[PDB]
Write a protein that binds this ligand. Sequence first.
Ligand SMILES: CN1C(=O)C2(CCN(c3nc4c(c(=O)[nH]3)CCCC4)CC2)c2ccccc21
Ligand SMILES: [Zn+2]
Lengths: 162, 47
Amino acid sequence: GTILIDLSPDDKEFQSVEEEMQSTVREHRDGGHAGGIFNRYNILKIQKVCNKKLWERYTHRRKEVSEENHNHANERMLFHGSPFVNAIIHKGFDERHAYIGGMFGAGIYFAENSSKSNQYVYGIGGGTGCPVHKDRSCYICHRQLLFCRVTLGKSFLQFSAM
Amino acid sequence: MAHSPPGHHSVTGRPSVNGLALAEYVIYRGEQAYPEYLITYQIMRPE
Ligand SMILES: CN1C(=O)C2(CCN(c3nc4c(c(=O)[nH]3)CCCC4)CC2)c2ccccc21
Ligand SMILES: [Zn+2]
């Protein structure tokens, strides 16, 4: 069911997605331990993920949330890093993508900072880094992130020491 | 999976220490996110 459509670097949609990647890089208090040491990315490819079933699953729930929240879906665009990116794009998010040891309970986590989600592409805390070099700071191996459409509805505000 | 707090649909985690960090968010239903863009990239070594 999933079709992946390559965007051209000359397409306006490619460029705005790259700029969201690049402008939300930050330094991390682990000094780069989990995600690597970098100030910016080399963006090699951006693909649009097309799946009619998954999309209608999303918009159906978005309408329920919106109607329980004074007609406000509170929809954001957020990053998500995971070793399971390939399962996600074909089958969608489910409870097997939930972070049990997460700071706000067993749910699915997203970040406004791209560099935060980058810390999880190779697993919890960066795992053992890239498969080829075991290097959490590998500058060679290609990585993948998801830029996701997310319905927050009425969101519970947690002030975490982060 | 856990549930969002009663009457809520998600949790927003705001950094109360590092003024430079942005928010992180949690949802408890997978149908509340759609994986819209797949981005292939390398991190770049600082010059
Ligand atoms: C089930 N499983 C997970 O869910 C993760 C991958 C996705 N994870 C994640 N966590 C966060 C952010 C993010 O993009 N992705 C950004 C905001 C802060 C936290 C959580 C851990 C994982 C890694 C290894 C093995 C299994 C799992
Ligand atoms: Zn590598």
